[model samples]
Target chain A: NKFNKEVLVARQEIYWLPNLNWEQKFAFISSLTNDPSQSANLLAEAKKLNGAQPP
Target chain B: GSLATTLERIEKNFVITDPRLPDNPIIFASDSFLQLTEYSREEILGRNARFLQGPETDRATVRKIRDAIDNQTEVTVQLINYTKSGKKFWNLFHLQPMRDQKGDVQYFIGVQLDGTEHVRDAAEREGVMLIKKTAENIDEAAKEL
Candidate 1:
């Protein structure tokens, strides 16, 4: 039963991750992982991504 | 020149670290690696590749890497690793030690492949298949009764 829920989540994950920008991707990853402290560097990456455009 | 040219053409992320250097820093990183991690060459150089690791990074895998490097043998493992920006990706990591003609180890090479999509896809398919097979078996049992 628990595994079934995880499977349904996996199927949904395909569409979810591809559409995100770096910042949102960070949030998505941080949400799924048991660890969030490890995701701090991604905020830094998101800052750069946010600034990368309109050049 | 040929070796350099081939490395440039290869699609996989390739990195070379000089273990003899202080902190065993990155001496070389292929362009693909830079792109995969979304890190500029300047940010990556002079740092151990372990920066790719995160809170979820397994100590067991790290031990495997150490054991293989100590033995100078090649090892390949799959690990969940984070990108520079905090995106999590499943990585197929392959490592090999470089040696001089005299067989003295000089460097370690890492090849990283982002397997997040593939791993997720595989799990999804496998789960659906299992569900399908189980349902059929139960249906057959229902017919038996």
Candidate 2:
């Protein structure tokens, strides 16, 4: 007899940083994803698109 | 001339290649490099040329190339290049250091080789043999397994 391990996949959908600009939102997302370095380019591009400096 | 100066210029002048993929390769070639290499703008844009390196190209030298790029430093290396006409040549790649206003490396400018005979000979004598021997060993090992 083989016992199957209990596997649970939790799914939650929510929007954070509702009032933030693109750069701020990107920074928030990067922090949440635990990849600050990886998100630098994205944030930089967002800054360019928004015509603003990185926050 | 110095790595620091080159890196600083790269950040200011070049377009950031990838915003999402951190390890995804970035290219910093200018129109001049394409002209010198005998490659079209479309042919070389957004591609890393390290794939052209073979056995005659020392691994340590390659590593130095990678290290300089990764660390945002300027480095020069001699490597073999293949033209569209099946012509082999050497590239005395002179990497220019670039940086941003914040003094960060954004891109590198590379100067291509002017001569071909020496690199062609090196490729013929050592490059082809190394690739062949490696491939044969891989085949033999797979058969044994």
**TM, every model:** 0.54, 0.42
What C-alpha lDDT, on a 0 to 100 scale, does residue B96 get in candidate 1?
Answer: 70
Q: State the lDDT of candidate 2 residue by residue for A1-55, as single tens digits.
A: 0101110000000012123342344233323233323334544454454454334
lDDT of 1 by residue, A1-55 (tens): 2213332233224213333342343233323232223334444454454456434
Candidate 2 residue B128 C-alpha distance from true site, Å? 28
lDDT (Cα, 0-100) at B124 in candidate 2: 48
The positional error of residue B76 in candidate 1, measured at the CA in angstroms, is: 0.8
lDDT of each: 0.54, 0.39
Q: Ten residues in a row with the worst lDDT in model 1 chain B?
A: B1-10
Model 1's DockQ? 0.01
